[PDB]
């Protein structure tokens, strides 16, 4: 049957919001809401070879702050800070010159156990004509070796160019979806294949959060260092 979004079921209890701002009026609540979606989509659609895991947005009456986590930030940084200037101009055109931006790339730790880049890698493999069975298994084994709990991958679509759509799942371990205390990270991606669209869904279990609180604490960014800059 149908299931409630795993990310959406855990918001406001154990998971913080990706955008944290309070608008002035119901007219300014819509502009500030579509614009941040454009920024997030920009980061995700293009600049994909970087493995951007999550982009957070922080806005005040007039000051915009962006916290961008990536696995390989060299591509964003570019050759002696070139590509970086380009993206700043991109961000300024979307929000406006009248405001103040404080974009912040922040390098990420433990990149494997994140459902976003795994789905992106999965989608790239399917688009690259890689056999589906082999592609998921290599991603599954590497993620488990990274030192996490069970992972559930559902890859539904016109499998292998077939005319009848199927779906292949591969769970390997305890994925307690009905439990609220668990840390389940979820992401979904659309692999654009020449024979249509492939939907990949990745459920990852990253332990149990036994410390009550609406997070305010990082998630799989702590193990190695996490810095770099571009801020003020």
């Amino acid at each position: 049957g149908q299931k409630v979004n795993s990310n959406g079921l855990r918001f406001g209890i154990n998971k913080n919001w990706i955008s944290r701002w309070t608008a002035n009026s119901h007219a300014q609540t819509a502009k500030w809401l579509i614009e941040d979606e454009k920024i997030r989509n920009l980061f995700f659609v293009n600049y994909r070879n970087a493995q951007v895991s999550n982009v957070e947005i922080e806005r005040t009456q007039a000051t915009v702050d962006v916290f961008v986590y990536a696995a390989q930030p060299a591509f964003l940084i570019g050759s002696e800070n070139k590509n970086i200037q380009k993206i700043t101009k991109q961000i300024k055109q979307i929000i406006g010159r009248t405001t103040n931006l404080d974009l912040t790339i922040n390098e990420i730790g433990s990149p494997m156990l994140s459902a976003r880049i795994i789905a992106r890698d999965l989608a790239n493999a399917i688009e690259a004509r890689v056999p589906l069975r082999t592609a998921m298994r290599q991603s599954l084994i590497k993620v488990l070796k990274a030192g996490a709990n069970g992972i559930k991958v559902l890859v539904s679509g016109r499998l292998n160019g077939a005319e009848i759509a199927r779906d292949k799942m591969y769970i390997e371990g305890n994925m307690p979806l009905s439990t609220l205390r668990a840390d389940i990270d979820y992401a979904l991606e659309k692999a654009q294949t020449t024979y249509g669209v492939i939907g990949v869904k990745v459920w990852i279990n990253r332990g149990m959060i036994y410390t009550k609180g609406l997070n305010r604490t990082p998630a799989h960014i702590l193990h190695p260092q996490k810095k770099q800059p571009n801020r003020q």
Binding site: R20, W21, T22, T60, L214
Partner: protein
């Protein structure tokens, strides 16, 4: 010694609760580190708005989920502040989520 501001009525509101308590703890600690008689961090009723949205894309109006957004609210009135408190009030840095209604 001076005041320059009688009856400084600080009002707090935010979508989140735990951050709101944290901001009141920080505000109270600084304002008591200076010589001000805090009346008290009282709680106000939280205005809750609820929006009902149909889950399905086309049919089956019966299956409709719900969402909520709580406006947690607090009140805090300062009797006498003076520069000694006001200058220290400049370095507070209130976490974005909390919203201030300073009424002088």
């Amino acid at each position: 010694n001076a005041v320059k501001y009688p009856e400084l009525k600080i009002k707090l509101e935010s979508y989140d609760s735990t951050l709101l308590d944290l901001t009141t703890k920080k505000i109270v600690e600084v304002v008591k580190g200076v010589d001000v008689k805090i009346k008290g961090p009282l709680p106000l009723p939280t205005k809750k708005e609820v929006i009902t949205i149909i889950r399905s894309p086309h049919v089956d109006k019966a299956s409709r989920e719900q969402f909520e957004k709580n406006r947690h609210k607090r009140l805090m009135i300062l009797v006498d502040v003076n520069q000694g408190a006001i200058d220290s009030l400049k370095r507070i840095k209130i976490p974005v989520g909390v919203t201030l209604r300073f009424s002088k």
